[PDB]
RNA sequence: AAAAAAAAAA
RNA sequence: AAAAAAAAAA
RNA sequence: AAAAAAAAAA
RNA sequence: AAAAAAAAAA
RNA sequence: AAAAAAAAAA
RNA sequence: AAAAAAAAAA
RNA sequence: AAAAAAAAAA
RNA sequence: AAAAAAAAAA
RNA sequence: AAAAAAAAAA
RNA sequence: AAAAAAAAAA
RNA sequence: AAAAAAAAAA
RNA sequence: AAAAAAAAAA
RNA sequence: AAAAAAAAAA
RNA sequence: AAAAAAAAAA
């Protein structure tokens, strides 16, 4: 291959965009109480910690959740997700349970194309229920 | 295709990275004086205006330059690029000229693999000369 | 085939969901006045009569309508449907007419993928007009 | 694909059913005492928690069971299932044991076609034995 | 081919619609001031000048823009487009620049299927920025 | 498919037309006396009710007619169409009759290419005769 | 194709005929009394209402008949045709009956080649019988 | 499956 | 015969 | 797709 | 042999 | 079926 | 390469 | 894709 | 059409 | 050449 | 997919 | 990749 | 191996 | 030779 | 015979 700088024969000025979209997998944790649902706010996805603080909207594609701390004594971990939407909340309760007490439970759901509109910081993604005090989420989304 | 949320059968917690790399084409302008070379600082690529203020290093891959304002009366636009590098500056003067007084002049150079190390805000990309008072740059780079 | 119970060699505890989605064709009637349009509420679709009282949202896919009573003397039955949407109402008036006075008139419309968002009880599906005093609807939808 | 509503050329009024059947996998737990068998009532499957409170009969196809709490000290989890039938109870004791003390034990059984009649709330599905204080069941059935 | 009127053997009365949908490319102009973004209202698309005054909703599919007057002295024309959405505004700034001072600058963007819902007169399509005092827009859209 | 807005690399300003042509099937009704021909005016086709009030000309391609009310006692419906043209009226009498007293009569005629000139609101399409007091027309035409 | 008049290189004066033959399907109605046969006169086919008043002879090829008014209460329509010929009358009674009280009855017969001689106004085609007071006839014939 | 009108593309 | 939902399986 | 009547053509 | 108009057919 | 002049096209 | 108009030809 | 100048190689 | 980054899949 | 909307057809 | 035990069949 | 339930379709 | 976003190429 | 129940296997 | 740098070309 080349070992020196070489000339590019550029032409006209291209179409440009200083502030493009970005397809991402955002990891973050939320704290949960026993037997009480926690609504996950979209605003959690806008943070300098993720290089995403310059965005104001995001299109969520899929949501996956793991338990992040150990469960109560005698119990296996579990986590439930209930999808939420601005045009109408769901009542599905997708649930995963561990089969080894020392292991995370996990579950996720995919959002269909007809429901992939933008959300803003004030919106919510889903409700989380778990017998563990922390749940780790990984959300796949397109920032725009 | 599906019209409702569906279950994902997630497994172990994956490898994650909250602060990933980003391949970009960054557009910005600089002011140049007649007969005086202008050193383009790498720090210009780190700005909230480009969603890149969270990075501190970047690997520049190629530089393209267009004249941005009209040339002096009776002349055609021209722009020159001289590559700069921390381990040793170049003396090439890649030059483009307009063939129509009303049109931009353009030129670019590609940086070879063996010279694609990181730069930081205090470093310089290249020297620009032009008979126009502004030059528009589009730099292809990998933020990391 | 087997005539007795046989063992299943079950494995880890699976992903579960106690409240799944349901793809349905719901049949109900509405009362129509002459010359006056009737707005069909989405809330009609949530009812123990359909096994759907546990849902709060629904994604409507297609609407079909039939006249359910005889037309006025000398007339042939007709029915019109005007689609309604929360992001903006349509002005189409899909219309079916009977070619035999003793026969139902019918018409339907399909909602495109890009408009299949959720609707809740307070929302409306469409407007119905008819010269018959009742209209029977069958709505294809996904409860979620 | 289409971006707007389009007409459907509906025909005669179709055959309809407002209360269809539903093929389901229902997950619930039961409390078990040491040394004592627990009869699992069919009535557990009818509940608003499963969107099934509108059904009065169900045809059970297969039963699967997992231990839901940790076993006694020094022991590995186990669970046994004895199938029950209105025309005559079985004496099989399908049994699963854990090979890791921290792991659920599991077992299931399939009901043959010739024994898939309806069962109502007063009937029983099976007997459960376990050295763990709770057992999680998933039952595959057709509500009708 | 035939030179006279001939008979059609028509059948039963068909499904009809007196107010159908219309796929269109609407051309119009907006006035913009330097350094100020102009929000383009959807209501611009409803006008007798386009035969569209009888619609109240539209699904926007793509937006293209051109500069419509000459740029300031010594400058090349430019135009930026920032998409707007009811469910959440974007921060992209799609930009095109002229390479001959006597030529229009142009740029455009396409709206994805998941974001093609309806918009009414009070909604906005996008923000426009330019150094030219007028910008010509051509919007591909579906009136319904 | 794509889930976010993407750039279009627009070129030169295209050819545009804010007021285009429209191929339509227009349904309307006319009142008829027994034994008396009714001349159907072309102006019926220009109406806000059809989104056509901005057109002043139209090219009729085909005419189809149905009886719209029940026939006199003891009779079967019938309907006759006689084409009219500015350059010379026809004397054809295309006729349809019902074979069931409860059923619409219908007939149609196609206009040949050499006769597809423009007509204006003061022109006439055809003559209608029927033993029913109302006739329903569906005209296929091109508005220009 | 050509858009202007063009020359024909005509030759010798051709064979001509100002009064050609005409294959036609003539529709007309006759009045019938209960229990009485009606002889259909051939003269009914020579009329300005059919553009045939310039013919004095006709060759009848086939005869079809429909009932034209409702039958008496409780009865289904029927119609009978008995062919008549100048060289000798038939005694067949081709009959058709309705299977729905509201629909027309119909029947017809074909005249074989050996019997297709000319007929004039004073001749008869056939005898009609019917329990309906009017019968509609369509006769396929060659005017010469 | 072919065609006309409007839209969009390689 | 293809595709979407819930269930079951090699 | 075949046949009759009228028209036109290689 | 191909086409238009009227008629008839599988 | 080939060619020239004017027009129009993929 | 196909077509229209004028011309010319086997 | 072919050629010249400089460099490197099987 | 090939390659790099992020995302997603059999 | 493929697709959407309106129209027409075997 | 092959085999042993019990059952059943062309 | 095959089969059962509810939905939709050529 | 197929797809989306950003980049680059024939 | 195909199938059901129990057992054993690549 | 393949490649890099500079030049020139279809
Ligand atoms: Mg009937």
UniProtKB/Swiss-Prot annotation, chains A, B, C, D, E, F, G:
Domain of life (superkingdom): Viruses
GO cellular component: viral capsid
Cellular compartments annotated: Virion
Xref: InterPro entries: Satellite_virus_coat_sf
GO molecular function: structural molecule activity
Gene3D superfamilies: Satellite virus coat domain
Miscellaneous notes: This virus depends on tobacco mosaic virus for its replication.
Protein name, as recorded: Coat protein
Organism lineage string: Viruses, Riboviria, Virtovirus, Tobacco virtovirus 1
